[PDB]
């Protein structure tokens, strides 16, 4: 009686230490009263079930035996649908199970807001939380086991259309792009390093394209991304809004840069329109107002604040999830540093630090999750693993130091970043392979190299993903290294810029495999 | 019990006498439909009940009309929601029962070749009460009603396509906008012959203004699809006229881009249009079996039939598509002038071509008169229509006597425009009248309006009225001059900016007329 709670609640708040202490005992007996009536229902009909189940597997049993011709046909049609709507009660009731715990946990949380108090938590962690009706985890194994026995024995506009426009807008401002770099640039002076160097928000934007395509991929293929990121199921963002909201800034990037090779209104200077993209898209994402996706915003602004300061607060999926990202994404950090620089003028060893931050901040992660959980493996592999890039790059770094300035000791470090480029790349590639993706099991016979079980259609995209990573593992590293500017004048930021695409395209490859892990095996003892 | 009488028929084919089955066989057919009839009275009758009990308590709590009460609305709203469902539920089950009947006993008649099933299905079921009673529909509209007032699917793939091309479109027509008024350094006669091939665009301005006509028919309850005869199961969503209209957008924006910019130097500046026009046709007559080939082999026989119509019957499409291509002979005279341009790079046939679409139209309600006989509402079309052709004939002549300067040339002008008054007046009040149905006797709340109004807001209709009678003027006046009396240059541009004002003319009037011919049959296509 969610609303009937509510009332009491809001009677009580007007109604109004003795008075609200007699209050609280009252709605906790009706709170214990609801959750019994809750657990009571929910065992009946979860032993329902699980009868019915029997029955129902005895009964296709018995056909079964029987087929290894009209009066079987008939029993096969029968049972197929006694299946489905028996599936269709396994689903009711467990959506049943979330909506009470919802409910539950929603209204306990507003007692705790009208009273200032925090009983209500409690209360809900010390009843709710460990109800036989929540922690009993017999609904999943049902619907699984319905769901394999059939599979094996028997058998909005709006938001597409405005995804259509942004599309469409895109790939056209797309090709007047090439067409007037290629005609209407009559600037040979040092106009190709500058913006060169502006592929900022555009890798940003072909991300979050990727990260629409992610989303689309796991909703498809199966895994419930909903649950590893803690995601309500109600407000879900499926693929058309990543879809719609990369186009957006695609549609931004593309015009700032377009008029920056054009000559719009003369009084406007040529400078400032990356600056007015770059503050649009901050704004955008900052907009403190409810609209354009104000929950999507507020909760990827609240995990960026978690993520940047994570030794204060505990790791959960998304914390790594993001973090990881982030890591890949580096070139767009360097980017807006270089940025600030120019601006604030027009190796001093700033460029090397921004850029290894983002292995900083996942490193300190690993050892925030080694200390909550206090079990030296994986953890400290993974601590291992992301200070060889820490190590690399300050190597890197002095390496070009030396030998631009002229120290004979150059060779030694060029010895040391040869090294550090493989103990660096090895690990990434075999963790990668191992862990985060899980491939490489023993117990896999049929599925030759891969894992017992296998999610997506065809092996072949296993196949060629194992390749694809391991020529593009090494292409991240040596980019790494490069970005730190060795010395390679010219042939480098043409070439970062030509590989951090590729990197991205990493991580969405990535991205789907350990989702995938995730969802079949644990690996990150991350639930439970 | 739909399965266990398949399995019946099935049965009795393979244990195969025929007419014991089939007395057994109706028998069960009778059962269960009094079974079928018994349910849905007694759950009608609770319906009923159920309603006026909530009616009651709601009346109840709105005469009172604090927590108590704002209680009692929450509650009766979700008892409303309920009770919403639960007709629903019982309709689909009156219309599932019905196919089930209509459906086995078809297959009892494809199966033993026999048309029992049909005379019985007509003779039982289809004057059933269950099927009959209508009384399902009132209880709902009833329920939505009360609930409004005291209380408060097109594929993914195409919505997608109809948005990208949506898009290009319009990020085409800027760059044409931003080319032609910066980067034109072409002082020459240029202007005068893109400007005189604004031709297809006329089209798909029309085509988009079309799928909006099927967007807001849809939307309003005026079915379409019954008066077109189209495929009743099948049919054209305004999606798909978006979609084609956009594509044939797109082609003409990257036509027109080409023409202004400057292509591969091989290809010279005078092919484009002709490849633009060329793709079109063939799209429009492709033979293959893809790209819309059932709608677009539907408009071909159209064409073909309305262009030869004193021989073939007038349904009403014919007369649609008439009076459309009536609105677009811009198109028309834009096509000739192609053609004779090609040829050369009043002989003034162009004022025959213009005329030939009213050729077309008044010749297919003499047609319609031949074969009904009765001349009102016909003969006065035809003289309608026939004004077009005098007034274009006097114009012309006209124009040679002025050319040629005989002393007649003030009486002539005095004529024409006197036949030019009187025409636009009669298609005024044809339009008015009779395509519309405005003005009716029988009409005291709605105004100057009929007495029944589909359309929401009445403002709509009192602002359409006073767009006719100042457009009409403007295209009689625009048909007169592209006559080019003299005209030089003064003529051609107001002749183009008038004929996209003429297709929104044609779009107004589309949506009143097929209103009117829902309601009434004014135009006697129907019974």
New interface residues.
Partial sequence: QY?AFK?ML??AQDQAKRYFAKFEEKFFQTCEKELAKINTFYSEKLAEAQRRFATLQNELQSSLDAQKERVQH?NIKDLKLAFSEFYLSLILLQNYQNLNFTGFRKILKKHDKILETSRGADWRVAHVEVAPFYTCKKINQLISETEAVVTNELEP?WT??????????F???NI?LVLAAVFKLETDRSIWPLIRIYRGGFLLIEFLFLLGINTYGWRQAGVNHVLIFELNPRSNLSHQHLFEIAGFLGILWCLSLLACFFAPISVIPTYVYPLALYGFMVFFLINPTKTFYYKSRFWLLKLLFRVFTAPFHKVGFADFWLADQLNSLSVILMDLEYMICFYSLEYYGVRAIVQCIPAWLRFIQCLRRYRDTKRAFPHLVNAGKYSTTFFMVTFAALYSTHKERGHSDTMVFFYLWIVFYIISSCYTLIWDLKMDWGLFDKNAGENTFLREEIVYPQKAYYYCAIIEDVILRFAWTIQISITSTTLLPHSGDIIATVFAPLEVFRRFVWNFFRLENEHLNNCGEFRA
């Fill in positions: 609303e009332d809001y009677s008939r506009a597409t259309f405005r995804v259509g426009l942004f599309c469409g807008i790939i056209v401002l007047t």
